[PDB]
Design a protein around this nucleic acid. Sequence first.
DNA 1: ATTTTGACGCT
DNA 2: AGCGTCAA
Length: 429
Amino acid sequence: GPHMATGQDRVVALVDMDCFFVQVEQRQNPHLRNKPCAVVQYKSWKGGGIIAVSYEARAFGVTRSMWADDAKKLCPDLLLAQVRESRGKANLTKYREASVEVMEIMSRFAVIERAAIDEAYVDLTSAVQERLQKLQGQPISADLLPSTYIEGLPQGPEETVQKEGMRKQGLFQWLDSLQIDNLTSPDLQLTVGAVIVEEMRAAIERETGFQCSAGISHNKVLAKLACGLNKPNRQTLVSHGSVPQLFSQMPIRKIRSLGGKLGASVIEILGIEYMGELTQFTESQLQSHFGEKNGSWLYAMCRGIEHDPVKPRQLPKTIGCSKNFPGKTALATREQVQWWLLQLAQELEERLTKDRNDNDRVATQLVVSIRVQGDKRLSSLRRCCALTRYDAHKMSHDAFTVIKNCNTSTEWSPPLTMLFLCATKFSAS
DNA sequence: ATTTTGACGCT
DNA sequence: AGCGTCAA
Ligand SMILES: Nc1ncnc2c1ncn2[C@H]1C[C@H](O)[C@@H](COP(=O)(O)NP(=O)(O)OP(=O)(O)O)O1
Ligand SMILES: [Mg+2]
Ligand SMILES: [Mg+2]
């Protein structure tokens, strides 16, 4: 009753760029704008692998991971932009730099947690408190929320036939119901959060040209889920009260962290399909099947409650470079292995030197990882060494030294299907 | 031959 | 420390 926490203490947003790498390339090349477009890496093997797809191309069925030759079978007029290749490998610098543009804009509004190259969480609790104080009892106009959806609305009792009509009808129902007079109202706090996110998204688009979607809720899992509900170029508010109906038909795998083996086990062991069905288990039952940590997390999450903080971290914690060597291209000679370690180490050196100048820090550990032909696991072996000098020849030599005894017997066997260098354990400089 | 990353958990 | 999970 009066003591049941409801996980309504925070306002959290997740901002995710729409078809991000495609938009970077469309900004650079106006010929690609408003077209079915994709970004591809490599070209010789089946036209290259698609890693990003414009919404116009998705309408034809083009997806991430498709070979470009096959995408062309679905979408003959598909336009393609190629990832830069340097030193024999795909080089993602352009997208990392565009990411920095967006992150630097978002951080003007609030503390952000960089969650991936194109998305960040925002803890808006303090900003909402401030805006509620400058704005005192003044109602919030629908004009302040021109691209916001209220999940679950409209409900109940003809513009309803088109999607913008429905959006406005749901928003009107929501705002009509709001009580602006209580500064402690969670629903009001979320609404002010959404106003701020509209401002943030407008700033991102104005200052970079890039469009994005966003979720606004009380925690990161719900913000992330909300964000995906009305992509692209829209934002979605998931209130605490919307959770029971939303979760009643939500496949377990759609919640972040449950998309893999753990989610599959939740489905298989409990014989359920949707997140809401989890409410019928005690915390102890869930802990018994999935462990203390997972059990408690699931017990709270299925009720819309999660406490994971927005971490104050705008910069990546590691800087890595990897290359796969599939099928017949697997590395089978000592010289091959050393040459590719050098290529990787040279890209890594460039990125580390820039990072040291920009961010006043230095990496102190080098992690070397390899995969052997036949092993399905991403990494077959991982070994570390000291990272004491930003020198590509030294880093590549040290990596060879730490992995050379994996070679069973001038020849390398079994052939290597992946090399990976990662700089870790940063200290201030 | 789904590539190139990145964060965090378990022991 | 080294491996495993999940993710974009
Ligand atoms: N498996 C993968 N491998 C390589 N790059 C990937 C990737 N998944 C994503 N990327 C890269 C390429 C992507 O552009 C970028 C962001 O990933 P998203 O946010 O998952 N997808 P996007 O922004 O394209 O579309 P929208 O969000 O509107 O659905 O990260
Ligand atoms: Mg995105
Ligand atoms: Mg994303």
